[PDB]
Nucleic acid binder design. Structure first.
Ligand SMILES: [Mg+2]
Ligand SMILES: [Mg+2]
Ligand SMILES: [Mg+2]
Ligand SMILES: [Mg+2]
Ligand SMILES: [Mg+2]
Ligand SMILES: [Mg+2]
Ligand SMILES: [Mg+2]
Ligand SMILES: [Mg+2]
Ligand SMILES: [Mg+2]
Ligand SMILES: [Mg+2]
Ligand SMILES: [Mg+2]
Ligand SMILES: [Mg+2]
Ligand SMILES: [Mg+2]
Ligand SMILES: [Mg+2]
Ligand SMILES: [Mg+2]
Ligand SMILES: [Mg+2]
Ligand SMILES: [Mg+2]
Ligand SMILES: [Mg+2]
Ligand SMILES: [Mg+2]
Ligand SMILES: [Mg+2]
Ligand SMILES: [Mg+2]
Ligand SMILES: [Mg+2]
Ligand SMILES: [Mg+2]
Ligand SMILES: [Mg+2]
Ligand SMILES: [Mg+2]
Ligand SMILES: [Mg+2]
Ligand SMILES: [Mg+2]
Ligand SMILES: [Mg+2]
Ligand SMILES: [Mg+2]
Ligand SMILES: [Mg+2]
Ligand SMILES: [Mg+2]
Ligand SMILES: [Mg+2]
Ligand SMILES: [Mg+2]
Ligand SMILES: [Mg+2]
Ligand SMILES: [Mg+2]
Ligand SMILES: [Mg+2]
Ligand SMILES: [Mg+2]
Ligand SMILES: [Mg+2]
Ligand SMILES: [Mg+2]
Ligand SMILES: [Mg+2]
Ligand SMILES: [Mg+2]
Ligand SMILES: [Mg+2]
Ligand SMILES: [Mg+2]
Ligand SMILES: [Mg+2]
Ligand SMILES: [Mg+2]
Ligand SMILES: [Mg+2]
Ligand SMILES: [Mg+2]
Ligand SMILES: [Mg+2]
Ligand SMILES: [Mg+2]
Ligand SMILES: [Mg+2]
Ligand SMILES: [Mg+2]
Ligand SMILES: [Mg+2]
Ligand SMILES: [Mg+2]
Ligand SMILES: [Mg+2]
Ligand SMILES: [Mg+2]
Ligand SMILES: [Mg+2]
Ligand SMILES: [Mg+2]
Ligand SMILES: [Mg+2]
Ligand SMILES: [Mg+2]
Ligand SMILES: [Mg+2]
Ligand SMILES: [Mg+2]
Ligand SMILES: [Mg+2]
Ligand SMILES: [Mg+2]
Ligand SMILES: [Mg+2]
Ligand SMILES: [Mg+2]
Ligand SMILES: [Mg+2]
Ligand SMILES: [Mg+2]
Ligand SMILES: [Mg+2]
Ligand SMILES: [Mg+2]
Ligand SMILES: [Mg+2]
Ligand SMILES: [Mg+2]
Ligand SMILES: [Mg+2]
Ligand SMILES: [Mg+2]
Ligand SMILES: [Mg+2]
Ligand SMILES: [Mg+2]
Ligand SMILES: [Mg+2]
Ligand SMILES: [Mg+2]
Ligand SMILES: [Mg+2]
Ligand SMILES: [Mg+2]
Ligand SMILES: [Mg+2]
Ligand SMILES: [Mg+2]
Ligand SMILES: [Mg+2]
Ligand SMILES: [Mg+2]
Ligand SMILES: [Mg+2]
Ligand SMILES: [Mg+2]
Ligand SMILES: [Mg+2]
Ligand SMILES: [Mg+2]
Ligand SMILES: [Mg+2]
Ligand SMILES: [Mg+2]
Ligand SMILES: [Mg+2]
Ligand SMILES: [Mg+2]
Ligand SMILES: [Mg+2]
Ligand SMILES: [Mg+2]
Ligand SMILES: [Mg+2]
Ligand SMILES: [Mg+2]
Ligand SMILES: [Mg+2]
Ligand SMILES: [Mg+2]
Ligand SMILES: [Mg+2]
Ligand SMILES: [Mg+2]
Ligand SMILES: [Mg+2]
Ligand SMILES: [Mg+2]
Ligand SMILES: [Mg+2]
Ligand SMILES: [Mg+2]
Ligand SMILES: [Mg+2]
Ligand SMILES: [Mg+2]
Ligand SMILES: [Mg+2]
Ligand SMILES: [Mg+2]
Ligand SMILES: [Mg+2]
Ligand SMILES: [Mg+2]
Ligand SMILES: [Mg+2]
Ligand SMILES: [Mg+2]
Ligand SMILES: [Mg+2]
Ligand SMILES: [Mg+2]
Ligand SMILES: [Mg+2]
Ligand SMILES: [Mg+2]
Ligand SMILES: [Mg+2]
Ligand SMILES: [Mg+2]
Ligand SMILES: [Mg+2]
Ligand SMILES: [Mg+2]
Ligand SMILES: [Mg+2]
Ligand SMILES: [Mg+2]
Ligand SMILES: [Mg+2]
Ligand SMILES: [Mg+2]
Ligand SMILES: [Mg+2]
Ligand SMILES: [Mg+2]
Ligand SMILES: [Mg+2]
Ligand SMILES: [Mg+2]
Ligand SMILES: [Mg+2]
Ligand SMILES: [Mg+2]
Ligand SMILES: [Mg+2]
Ligand SMILES: [Mg+2]
Length: 275
RNA sequence: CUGCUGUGAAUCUGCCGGGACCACCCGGUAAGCCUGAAUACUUCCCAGUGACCGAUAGCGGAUUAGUACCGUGAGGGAAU
RNA sequence: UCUACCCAUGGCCAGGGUGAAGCGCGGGUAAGACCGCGUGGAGGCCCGAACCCACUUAGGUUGAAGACUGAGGGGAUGAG
RNA sequence: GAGUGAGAAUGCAGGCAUGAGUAGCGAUUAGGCAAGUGAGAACCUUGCCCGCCGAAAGACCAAGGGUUCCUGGGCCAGGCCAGUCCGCCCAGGGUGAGUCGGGACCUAAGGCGAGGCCGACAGGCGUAGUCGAUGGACAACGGGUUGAUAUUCCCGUACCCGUGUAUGUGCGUCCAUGAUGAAUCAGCGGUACUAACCAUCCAAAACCAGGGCUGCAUGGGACCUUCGUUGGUAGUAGUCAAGCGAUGGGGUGACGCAGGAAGGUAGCCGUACCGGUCAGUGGUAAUACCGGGGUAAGCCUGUAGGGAGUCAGAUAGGUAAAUCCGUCUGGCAUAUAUCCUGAGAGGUGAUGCAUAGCCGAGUGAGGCGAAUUCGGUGAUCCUAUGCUGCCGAGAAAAGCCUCUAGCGAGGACAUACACGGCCCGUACCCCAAACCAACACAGGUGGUCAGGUAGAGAAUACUAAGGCGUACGAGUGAACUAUGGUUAAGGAACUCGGCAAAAUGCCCCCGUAACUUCGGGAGAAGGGGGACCCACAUGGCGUGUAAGCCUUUACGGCCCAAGCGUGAGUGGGUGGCACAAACCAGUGAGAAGCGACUGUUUACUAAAAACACAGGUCCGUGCGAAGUCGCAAGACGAUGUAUACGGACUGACGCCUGCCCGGUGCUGGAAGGUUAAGAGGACCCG
RNA sequence: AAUUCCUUGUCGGGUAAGUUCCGACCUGCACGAAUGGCGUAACGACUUCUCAACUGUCUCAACCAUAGACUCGGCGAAAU
RNA sequence: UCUGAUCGUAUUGGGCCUCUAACCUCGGACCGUAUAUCCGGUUCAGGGACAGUGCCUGGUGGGUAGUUUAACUGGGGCGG
RNA sequence: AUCAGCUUGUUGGUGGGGUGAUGGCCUACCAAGGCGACGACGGGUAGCCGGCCUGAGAGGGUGACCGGCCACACUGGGAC
RNA sequence: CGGCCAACUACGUGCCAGCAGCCGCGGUAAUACGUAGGGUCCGAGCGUUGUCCGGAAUUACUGGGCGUAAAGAGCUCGUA
RNA sequence: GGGAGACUGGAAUUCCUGGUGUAGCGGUGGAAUGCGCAGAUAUCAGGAGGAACACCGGUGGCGAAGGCGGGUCUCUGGGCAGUAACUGACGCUGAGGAGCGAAAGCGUGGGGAGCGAACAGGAUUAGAUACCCUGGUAGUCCACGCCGUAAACGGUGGGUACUAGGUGUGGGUUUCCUUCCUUGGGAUCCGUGCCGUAGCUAACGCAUUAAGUACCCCGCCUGGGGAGUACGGCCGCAAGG
RNA sequence: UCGAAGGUGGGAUCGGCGAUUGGGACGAAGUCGUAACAAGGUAGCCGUACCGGAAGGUGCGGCUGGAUC
RNA sequence: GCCCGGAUAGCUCAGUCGGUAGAGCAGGGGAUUGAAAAUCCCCGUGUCCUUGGUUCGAUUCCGAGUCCGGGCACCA
RNA sequence: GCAUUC
């Protein structure tokens, strides 16, 4: 759920925080943690290539299993649900009967002690991962591969899910969280369920400093820059920019998907805008 | 004459040049290679010359001179 | 090697206030909501040194200083 | 034949005038006298005083500097005066490490980068690697000594890596003691070649206007075959048992922020005891006063605190194997049981070292040397990489431990003796005239120690240890300027404006409005008390010794007179103009505009109403995405996946956000009009 | 009106006196709904107006001390 | 053979559906390789004569670059 | 009730004081009580009664004179 | 002296001047206006205003109501 | 069809994809905006998605009222009859108070087919901020809160006893006639309708389901307007109650 | 010690005036529509919401205190 | 003040070529109605602001004057 | 279909 802060200070008025109710353990698996460091939005040239990044809390990477392909038939039990800094969803530590320990995105409703299984023979129960071929149409799924063996790429953020609409030949038709309908190979893997932590979107961060903790630097509006800095810059007093809205690099607001991408053959229709 | 991109021949009745192009004459024999001398220059070494300078001149530098000193640095840079 | 921003790894923030959530107990009820009393120690929270700023004013203005000094001023567990 | 004629280009170089014997001589501490030295003394030396700093202007470092350090000498440059002095000049001397700070150890960001990929060339990136501390690991403390170094030399006592010899205990390759487990022959049931048995489904050919045969398909039991069962051979021959053990596997290393409480110690304040003083004053001979009232690492011991279940069977998940780790099943556990970890107390180290004083004797060296108990207070240091809470969820590698793989005939451990322990730094300055500042410059410079009395305090006042008086002085009641001080009566009449001053200020009680997002507003406002002495008081509270009580007798527990410390209140008295006494230390109230708020900004005339902000909407983006850097490769976005990411405008919150798609963008469409190169090649011309 | 030229608009309030300020009117030169409109508790070294207290800001200036100024000795510039 | 309607044999262009073999894959596995999210090879699984990239060509193109933007004038601008 | 909470000598106790007398009447200590929708605490109005006026009565209104109580004596306080 | 409510006609103005407790009377023929004659009720008094009760069963105890006139809480549960 | 949760079914509207196929479709009192000719409407197939549940289905059932209808399953409330086994007046009502409470509306997050305030055009008209037409946003739907009103009506407060009958219908019991046919008929208990006596009512009407005859408790009225308004207060995010 | 009057302070509460501004009632023969009463020419009314010079219009749910059949 | 555009029926607006003055509303007379309004049918209404000039002829093509809308009156 | 007022 969401816990609302009391208005004891201007910075806290209106703000809220996760109740972290699903969290069972406060520390990660040592053997599944890798180091991570901040990039500040700078690339190999040391140039800022993504603005508004830097200054966030230090965090470590939990190795998430996005393939789940080498454990068909080996059941696992959910040992813990824990917080991950690197994504909106929570993560579930699985103990396989192999004695292997792996992290997976925690689906909605998955509790400690549940049994999870993988592969063609698995039951259609939240957290079970199996080829789309064996997933009946109409089911809600997440963490879907784009290419067989490529690893889960779609529907990974907290609360999101994909609906498997149907199967025809080698392809399954999927409705994306965005609403776009697209085809994927039926050999591609998916996990049954929605993604957990769906309440996170309702959090009111409350104050500038908390976004700084999350690594977001301030965004200066174009209209308050000078012409040399931004096409919207300039003018005496307040202005609307003095021209059609453009990026800081002058690109107009239009479609930016490249024409004639090969994936255009797999896309049935694009998302609808302003429905 | 020559680069890149397409297209793409004939072995002497051949082919290529004679300022679009054609004919006729003339010259030559492409898509293989090598080649001394006459020409250009002087960090450095030797022997000399000047209706050239003679210490604010002549080299930035006749004197610890690319030194002292200035500059983060590239670099600037004396005076005796 | 100034300055702007970022990355990694360390350090620093006298003293004094206020009293969030949570927890516990007692009222209250059919159970609650709710209400007292503790415990608790939250916060770009409060007052205020170090420290970081530079709001007002006087002096300096061939300065002690190519931007400073005195007197007050702001932030001071944090976007430090 | 000309580098041939200067008065001027805010011309250039050198020398030198004018201003002028003028302005200055660089803080907010301050010097004085006596004596000495010397040609010369306000400034040098010594003594006695005075003053200043004392979270520093004291003490120790990093960075930086580079001989500035010590001794002797110098005094025509330098020092804002003089100079016998100097951070200046000259000569000589001075820096000693297995343990300190680094390397020979380890990695972070980042750098470089074998091959490599990309790029006309130049080059751009980057893999394996290899560097790179601000972090990880790793062995020493106290005292003494030189003119100048000292955890480095010496003394005392330790600790950590190596090497050789000797001696003594067990452990063994070959001998042999213990230990397991596998091939194969032979006696048995369900897989199951294959011909059939049973149940069930279908119609080629099909009869007639529903009926049969045959074949096909599926499931069950059964012969061959094969797998499994249990008798022999085969513990026959194999294999394993002493240690070393990874470059490989697994643990640990291994981590945030806030917040106490508790238990300690350093330090400080007293005190038993010890040594000693009479400071020419009215009183004060021990009753008063002054000085001591010390001592590390290490090694014993294992308290407060914190942290943990253990054994057995199975396993190939851990890029091979595993007795290790992980996982799953069983049995036994809630104990002050056991073990790990760990402040401190105590013991030892220490018959030593050190010290208040006292001898003589002055160049200042040397000898002798007392007491050393008990309490109180108390850390920002230690237990603590702990514990509790929270969300923003908090390096790596080596090292260490363990596991096998693999090495193995020799090897492990203990004691004694004799030895090795490399390289670089080490002087001195280091909040400063020795670093950054052109200067012996009121600026700047990270870290470590933190005495006392007032006090909440690292504020502030005075002051101890220690360090300074810091480099022009001497005079003098001018105006005037600066910096402080006081002011009759009036009290904003000043002025653009209460600018600047003045005022308020502390602690404990009482008492506090509109409005509100119910948190606030609020220290709202307004008001009362505060000194000293005595009594209550041989009281209350903290601490806690003797005695006493309990016990799991120990580094136990309970209680506790005395002793020490310490408020708060009540009553009475006493003194002043004043009791927050000095220093220190909110002015308050009513209302409007703008911005919600804490923040950010024009280094050096603007700090704001500008920027940011949490919140909102739109647009883009389906994934080496969109966007951005790049010629590319590649990178960031993101080890993210539409509850995400980028861009645009708006800017907490409350109530709301109307009409226009003609213009110009953006999105979609393609029936018309128009339209490139490429195709075509009529006809015409030479 | 941080927007109003005319304009010190007009009326009310505050003052002995108010081109500023507060409340209104609407004749909006030339407001207006995310270059958001209208409000808003809390917050401000922002800007504006009023009051209490307080004062050398003033009526109106006087006196004291220190650093310069001034005198003597030493050193000894500068712009022009 | 011609006004013109048609069928099959060639030649040659346009569209559309497929196929695999060029080409592509930051999809999997394996090897070079002790080490290796580089790179290369092998192979499997997908795209596929499309895409990408040469050359030629028409658009969009203040994203960037070089430049232009007169004179007269009772100062210049505006007007003329 | 368009007035829901009020009270700290306030509610009770003991030892004193006080009065003609009982009693927080006063006082020191001790206990934490007392009064309230059977309207406490507030606000408004009013001297009360025998009676009078009206009315079939019940009731409504009223308190001049006469008679009984109470209260005050320019306003507020005090005692002798 | 219209009806309540005892007591009527003429003249004068004609929605004027005026009357009135209520309903209502005055618009050139008024028993309601003004005057006169007559009449009626009271009489040293008669009228008017104010005030209270009655009529008012119109706060209904005696002594009223709530389907449609004013009036059943939107519906339950339950405290005194 | 009393409530709650979960899952699920088909018809139809809309959209999408693809055939077939053209030039009209759509709409009205009559038209026009509108949708088409870039391939609509119509017709066929497939897909998506949301909302409401035809027939059964009634002046019938259940619920305190508001209300409740596709199916299935799970959890759960009330009512009625029969039997008198049990308790032994434990009852009734209820100022304040608490809870529930259509639709609209409000907050946050989803969803959005159809419908549709506002908003556009078209038409009508003197005008037409309407009625009619074409579109169309909040909303209507879901999750969790808030709001607390309706002609929330039987315009009829709750409990109890009594006072001619007749006739429908829903849920139980029982006696007879007997085929044992059974809507055969009777009696009885509990609902729900119609019609009618007595009695009541100003009348209309009510009439064993009272507005009759009586007892207990609550709420409410006191001429029409001003006004269910102002002020104060309480509640609410606001609207407002 | 207690203590009238007096002083100071921040609030309670009851009123009066107030530029400007809200609605209410009444008034003669004014202006604009025609919403209600008949099916009042779109049945009316109730709650609520949005809109419009005004009456009022429209949506959602409700009522008959609704005509014709 | 400078530069534009205006000025036509009672009102609001077209017209322009040098040979014109036309629309909607209002007004007047009929019709419809018991009577108004709405509606329907016949009618009337012009220095084309003033002013001079060109021309055979001016609403029209020039210059001037009055009145009225727009864009400007700036830099120290 | 339309049909306001006195
Ligand atoms: Mg790099
Ligand atoms: Mg951004
Ligand atoms: Mg997370
Ligand atoms: Mg968010
Ligand atoms: Mg911004
Ligand atoms: Mg700007
Ligand atoms: Mg630009
Ligand atoms: Mg502007
Ligand atoms: Mg979006
Ligand atoms: Mg040629
Ligand atoms: Mg050659
Ligand atoms: Mg010479
Ligand atoms: Mg020279
Ligand atoms: Mg430079
Ligand atoms: Mg240098
Ligand atoms: Mg703060
Ligand atoms: Mg700054
Ligand atoms: Mg000066
Ligand atoms: Mg300062
Ligand atoms: Mg201050
Ligand atoms: Mg302050
Ligand atoms: Mg502060
Ligand atoms: Mg904090
Ligand atoms: Mg010359
Ligand atoms: Mg000369
Ligand atoms: Mg000269
Ligand atoms: Mg001179
Ligand atoms: Mg002079
Ligand atoms: Mg002078
Ligand atoms: Mg001087
Ligand atoms: Mg000095
Ligand atoms: Mg002397
Ligand atoms: Mg001196
Ligand atoms: Mg001092
Ligand atoms: Mg020296
Ligand atoms: Mg020396
Ligand atoms: Mg010397
Ligand atoms: Mg000298
Ligand atoms: Mg000198
Ligand atoms: Mg690296
Ligand atoms: Mg590289
Ligand atoms: Mg290379
Ligand atoms: Mg290294
Ligand atoms: Mg280091
Ligand atoms: Mg030394
Ligand atoms: Mg970790
Ligand atoms: Mg004496
Ligand atoms: Mg010890
Ligand atoms: Mg001793
Ligand atoms: Mg040293
Ligand atoms: Mg220096
Ligand atoms: Mg200095
Ligand atoms: Mg101190
Ligand atoms: Mg200090
Ligand atoms: Mg100095
Ligand atoms: Mg001096
Ligand atoms: Mg003086
Ligand atoms: Mg004075
Ligand atoms: Mg005075
Ligand atoms: Mg003044
Ligand atoms: Mg003045
Ligand atoms: Mg003024
Ligand atoms: Mg001031
Ligand atoms: Mg002051
Ligand atoms: Mg205030
Ligand atoms: Mg006195
Ligand atoms: Mg601000
Ligand atoms: Mg603050
Ligand atoms: Mg601020
Ligand atoms: Mg500035
Ligand atoms: Mg400033
Ligand atoms: Mg945002
Ligand atoms: Mg890209
Ligand atoms: Mg936009
Ligand atoms: Mg803005
Ligand atoms: Mg387009
Ligand atoms: Mg004004
Ligand atoms: Mg005025
Ligand atoms: Mg105003
Ligand atoms: Mg604007
Ligand atoms: Mg808008
Ligand atoms: Mg806008
Ligand atoms: Mg704004
Ligand atoms: Mg400020
Ligand atoms: Mg002086
Ligand atoms: Mg002098
Ligand atoms: Mg192509
Ligand atoms: Mg340009
Ligand atoms: Mg050029
Ligand atoms: Mg010009
Ligand atoms: Mg001019
Ligand atoms: Mg011009
Ligand atoms: Mg007594
Ligand atoms: Mg009275
Ligand atoms: Mg009566
Ligand atoms: Mg009579
Ligand atoms: Mg009565
Ligand atoms: Mg009466
Ligand atoms: Mg009545
Ligand atoms: Mg009744
Ligand atoms: Mg009624
Ligand atoms: Mg009712
Ligand atoms: Mg539900
Ligand atoms: Mg179609
Ligand atoms: Mg169709
Ligand atoms: Mg009840
Ligand atoms: Mg009630
Ligand atoms: Mg609703
Ligand atoms: Mg709304
Ligand atoms: Mg809603
Ligand atoms: Mg919504
Ligand atoms: Mg409710
Ligand atoms: Mg109601
Ligand atoms: Mg109803
Ligand atoms: Mg009702
Ligand atoms: Mg009844
Ligand atoms: Mg019945
Ligand atoms: Mg009846
Ligand atoms: Mg009745
Ligand atoms: Mg009313
Ligand atoms: Mg109301
Ligand atoms: Mg009110
Ligand atoms: Mg008024
Ligand atoms: Mg009507
Ligand atoms: Mg109607
Ligand atoms: Mg109508
Ligand atoms: Mg009606
Ligand atoms: Mg409407
Ligand atoms: Mg309706
Ligand atoms: Mg200007
Ligand atoms: Mg009319």
């Amino acid at each position: 759920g969401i816990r609302k802060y009391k208005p004891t200070t201007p910075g806290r008025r209106g703000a809220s925080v996760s109740d972290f109710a699903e969290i069972t353990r406060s520390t990660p698996e040592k053997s599944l943690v890798r180091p991570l460091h901040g990039k500040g939005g700078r690339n190999a040239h040391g140039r800022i290539t993504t603005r508004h990044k830097g200054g966030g809390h230090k965090r470590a990477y939990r190795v998430i299993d996005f393939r789940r392909h080498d454990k068909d038939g080996v059941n696992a039990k959910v040992a813990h649900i824990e917080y991950d800094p690197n994504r909106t969803a929570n993560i579930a530590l699985l103990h396989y009967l192999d004695g292997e320990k792996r992290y997976i995105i925690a689906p909605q409703g998955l509790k400690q002690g549940d049994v999870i299984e993988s592969g063609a023979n698995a039951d259609i129960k939240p957290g079970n991962n199996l080829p789309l071929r064996n997933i009946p149409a109409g089911t809600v799924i997440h963490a879907v591969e784009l290419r067989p063996g490529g690893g889960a790429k779609l529907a990974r953020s907290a609360g999101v899910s994909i609906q498997l609409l149907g199967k025809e030949g080698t392809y399954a038709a999927l409705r994306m969280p965005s609403g776009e309908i697209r085809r994927v190979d039926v050999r591609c893997r998916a996990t049954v369920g929605e993604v957990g932590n769906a309440e996170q979107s309702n959090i009111n961060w409350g104050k500038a400093g908390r976004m700084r903790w999350k690594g977001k630097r301030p965004t200066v509006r174009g209209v308050v820059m000078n012409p040399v800095d931004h096409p919207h810059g300039g003018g005496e007093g307040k202005t609307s920019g003095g021209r059609h809205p453009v990026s800081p690099w002058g690109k107009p607001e239009g479609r930016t998907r490249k024409p004639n991408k090969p994936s255009d053959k797999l896309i049935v229709r694009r998302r609808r805008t302003g429905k």
